[PDB]
Each structure stands twice: as C-alpha cells, then as structure tokens.
C-alpha cells in the first residue's frame, strides 16, 4: 500500500493524485507551482513504502500528454531514505531538451537497495508548473 509523498505547496490544478498510483501511464496529474510558477530546488515527489523493503528497481513516469506536456524538471535526482530525514542519491538526471510529454525514468539495481522512501527531487529552480503520471517500484 505505497503512498504518495510530494512537496506540500503544490496545488492540484488538474487530475487527481490517485492517478499516480493506478498503474496506468495514461492517467496523471498537473500541479501548479507557487513562488511565481517556479519549482524550487529541493521540491520532490515519490513514495512512502510504509516499511523498509529491498528494491530491485523503480519506474516513474514524469510529464503527461496534452496540457503541461513540457511541464517537467530539467535537473533532478533519484534518492532514497530509511527514515525520511537522511537521503542517499541513486542517480542525477539532466533532461533539458527532452521531447515533450511522458518520460519514463526506469532503473534496475543488480544488488537490491533497502529503502522506506524513494523519490525524485528537483536539483535546480525552474519556472514551470509540473505534470506526472506514475510512480512504481520493483521488489521481491
Ligand atoms: Ca497513472
Ligand atoms: Na505523452
């Protein structure tokens, strides 16, 4: 029963947050960002897994079709935590100039990674709102 965690200041402009956990790439959410339509570095979205589990991989789908198809971070990282206080980076991304629309962020770990929380986190201020479609883990 993983649940969504995300930056509290974002407003749900369209869609609904259950759409991010329904296993359908075609359903998403469009968040309005405050601070003058700016997502600041450190903002995040991901999963609280409820308990510490061994992860074999993740598959997160950022962006969505139509409205807000370009509304994505350009620099962000995948990180995990056991306690929701200390984080460890798995990968850093630069998707400047990525095509508009859904972008599948998928990683596989040869040796499982133990985590209770796992998320994408903005690395650089960007003057955009934000769309997402799906957050999933691969485990056990
Ligand atoms: Ca979905
Ligand atoms: Na799309």
Curated annotation (Swiss-Prot):
It is found in: Secreted. It comes from the Bacteria. Residues 1-140 form the F5/8 type C domain. Putative virulence factor which is likely to act on connective tissue during gas gangrene. Belongs to the glycosyl hydrolase 84 family. This is Hyaluronoglucosaminidase. The gene is nagH. The chain holds residues 807 to 946 of 1628 of the full protein.
